[PDB]
Design an enzyme around this catalytic site. Structure first.
Site, PDB file in Angstrom:
ATOM      1  N   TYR A   7      58.006  91.007  97.585  1.00  0.00           N
ATOM      2  CA  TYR A   7      56.910  90.038  97.596  1.00  0.00           C
ATOM      3  C   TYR A   7      55.695  90.671  96.924  1.00  0.00           C
ATOM      4  O   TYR A   7      55.748  91.832  96.515  1.00  0.00           O
ATOM      5  CB  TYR A   7      56.587  89.631  99.042  1.00  0.00           C
ATOM      6  CG  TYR A   7      55.688  88.420  99.175  1.00  0.00           C
ATOM      7  CD1 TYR A   7      56.061  87.188  98.641  1.00  0.00           C
ATOM      8  CD2 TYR A   7      54.470  88.501  99.848  1.00  0.00           C
ATOM      9  CE1 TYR A   7      55.244  86.076  98.763  1.00  0.00           C
ATOM     10  CE2 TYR A   7      53.646  87.393  99.976  1.00  0.00           C
ATOM     11  CZ  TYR A   7      54.037  86.185  99.430  1.00  0.00           C
ATOM     12  OH  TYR A   7      53.223  85.082  99.556  1.00  0.00           O
ATOM     13  N   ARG A  13      53.510  84.635 102.497  1.00  0.00           N
ATOM     14  CA  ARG A  13      54.749  84.056 103.013  1.00  0.00           C
ATOM     15  C   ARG A  13      55.750  85.093 103.534  1.00  0.00           C
ATOM     16  O   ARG A  13      56.675  84.740 104.261  1.00  0.00           O
ATOM     17  CB  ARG A  13      55.428  83.202 101.935  1.00  0.00           C
ATOM     18  CG  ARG A  13      54.679  81.927 101.576  1.00  0.00           C
ATOM     19  CD  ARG A  13      55.460  81.104 100.562  1.00  0.00           C
ATOM     20  NE  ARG A  13      55.166  79.672 100.647  1.00  0.00           N
ATOM     21  CZ  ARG A  13      54.443  78.964  99.776  1.00  0.00           C
ATOM     22  NH1 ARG A  13      53.886  79.526  98.705  1.00  0.00           N
ATOM     23  NH2 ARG A  13      54.274  77.663  99.985  1.00  0.00           N
ATOM     24  N   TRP A 103      47.118  78.208  96.267  1.00  0.00           N
ATOM     25  CA  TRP A 103      47.026  79.667  96.242  1.00  0.00           C
ATOM     26  C   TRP A 103      47.082  80.228  94.819  1.00  0.00           C
ATOM     27  O   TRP A 103      46.469  81.257  94.534  1.00  0.00           O
ATOM     28  CB  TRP A 103      48.143  80.297  97.087  1.00  0.00           C
ATOM     29  CG  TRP A 103      48.123  79.880  98.532  1.00  0.00           C
ATOM     30  CD1 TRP A 103      48.972  79.006  99.141  1.00  0.00           C
ATOM     31  CD2 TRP A 103      47.201  80.312  99.539  1.00  0.00           C
ATOM     32  NE1 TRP A 103      48.642  78.869 100.468  1.00  0.00           N
ATOM     33  CE2 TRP A 103      47.558  79.659 100.739  1.00  0.00           C
ATOM     34  CE3 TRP A 103      46.111  81.192  99.547  1.00  0.00           C
ATOM     35  CZ2 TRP A 103      46.861  79.853 101.934  1.00  0.00           C
ATOM     36  CZ3 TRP A 103      45.416  81.384 100.737  1.00  0.00           C
ATOM     37  CH2 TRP A 103      45.795  80.718 101.913  1.00  0.00           C
TER      38      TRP A 103
END
Ligand SMILES: CN(C)CCCC(=O)Nc1cncc(-c2cccc3[nH]ccc23)c1
Ligand SMILES: CN(C)CCCC(=O)Nc1cncc(-c2cccc3[nH]ccc23)c1
Ligand SMILES: N[C@@H](CCC(=O)N[C@@H](CS)C(=O)NCC(=O)O)C(=O)O
Ligand SMILES: N[C@@H](CCC(=O)N[C@@H](CS)C(=O)NCC(=O)O)C(=O)O
Ligand SMILES: [Mg+2]
Lengths: 198, 198
Positions: A7, A13, A103
């Site tokens: 990530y 998330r 975002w």
């Protein structure tokens, strides 16, 4: 089984997965990438999105699918079939709201506008619904902690960055946050994790 | 159990639940509402959204949470825990995309432009990912049909209303639709169900 989580260098998330690994005391590689490295990885992925979790040379995707997989047949899942449904429903309700935020928006004025609209107009109603749903119970679902409580704590932490007064009139939701943060495995991770804005 | 599904008179987000009920041969009341009776029911709903499912007096929300609850301990869910993760991931990927469409937009020109934008750029990208993920295999996950296949067929049916030529260069995805539609319980439901655009 060898685990590798990929990530960006943020909670975002991926953090729900990071909480779950910590709670279950599972070792994993926490791979954090810069945007400069991303397109080269993106092009190799089946659906071109992160977080992804590689398990024994098998690449999983979708954060909540992964979270559910990891918590299956553990105490973080629901204690009944119906509780498991309530867990999934609360997580999706939270995820639905967090997903509305732009975002990835590059235009700052358009980004700030949307954040302010969602935080001022929509967020307070979600808090009201969550607060009524919780009632005077100890956890969101059942008589013990679930990954829905983890997810609440994670989502609320990010929301509070932009709107610090979000839970001023919701002491019971503040209490729930503090209980999740008091769980030893979670507390340890909170202290040691990379400190980023998001 | 005594099931009662509440949603608008349309396929929409409820259709996945209707497919699962039909395939598993589970009886339920398919309550469809007009706009007039929505404000009254909306007030009684903890989170003010539909579909909802009432099970012996107990209310459930979030369409995919309900879908997963109904597929619990059946082959529709996926055979292994890993397959169930793949099923969940595909469904969330499809759901994420369908959620991008401005279904409630009142400005018709804005709606037209946003639909065209999503169907011209985003949809073809997703179709190529779905097609390569399926490959030459029979079903999306594992050796038998899952509710991920159901969901693909449902989502693609609505997408084809707005872009009839969406799958004209993806014969393998067309084949998957036909296979799902040919399932006896699904075939029966598709003939029985009320005719609606969405
Ligand atoms: C490079 N940059 C533009 C991309 C970074 C994307 C980003 O900031 N991701 C992010 C940051 N903060 C929260 C979420 C998010 C989205 C949806 C559901 C969520 N649940 C918890 C966090 C979360 C996602
Ligand atoms: C006017 N307003 C009251 C009606 C809006 C209802 C509507 O058009 N909903 C709708 C219609 N078609 C598809 C979806 C949808 C959204 C998100 C995920 C989905 N998955 C399957 C359908 C679907 C939702
Ligand atoms: N619903 C998915 C969404 C994943 C997603 O969209 N991730 C973003 C980062 S938060 C991403 O991959 N952005 C980079 C890109 O789209 O290229 C999930 O929860 O995993
Ligand atoms: N993620 C939820 C979303 C449900 C949802 O938002 N449904 C729409 C209709 S398709 C709705 O009820 N919107 C609230 C409203 O506009 O009153 C689910 O899948 O059940
Ligand atoms: Mg979702």
């Amino acid at each position: 089984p060898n685990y590798k989580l990929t990530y960006f260098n943020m909670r975002g998330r991926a953090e729900i997965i990071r909480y779950i690994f910590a709670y279950l005391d599972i070792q994993y590689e926490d791979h954090r990438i810069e945007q400069a490295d991303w397109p080269e990885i993106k092009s190799t992925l089946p659906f071109g999105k992160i977080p992804i979790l590689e398990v024994d040379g098998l690449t999983l995707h979708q954060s909540l699918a992964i979270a559910r997989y990891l918590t299956k047949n553990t105490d973080l899942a629901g204690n009944t079939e119906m509780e498991q449904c309530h867990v999934d429903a609360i997580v999706d309700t939270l995820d639905d709201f967090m997903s509305c935020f732009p975002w990835a928006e590059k235009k700052q004025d358009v980004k700030e506008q949307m954040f302010n609209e969602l935080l001022t107009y929509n967020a307070p109603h979600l808090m009201q619904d969550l607060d009524t749903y919780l009632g005077g119970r100890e956890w969101l679902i059942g008589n013990s902690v679930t990954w829905a409580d983890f997810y609440w704590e994670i989502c609320s932490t990010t929301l509070l960055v932009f709107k610090p007064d979000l839970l001023d009139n919701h002491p019971r939701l503040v209490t729930l946050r503090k209980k999740v943060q008091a769980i030893p495995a979670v507390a340890n991770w909170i202290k040691r994790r990379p400190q980023t804005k998001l």
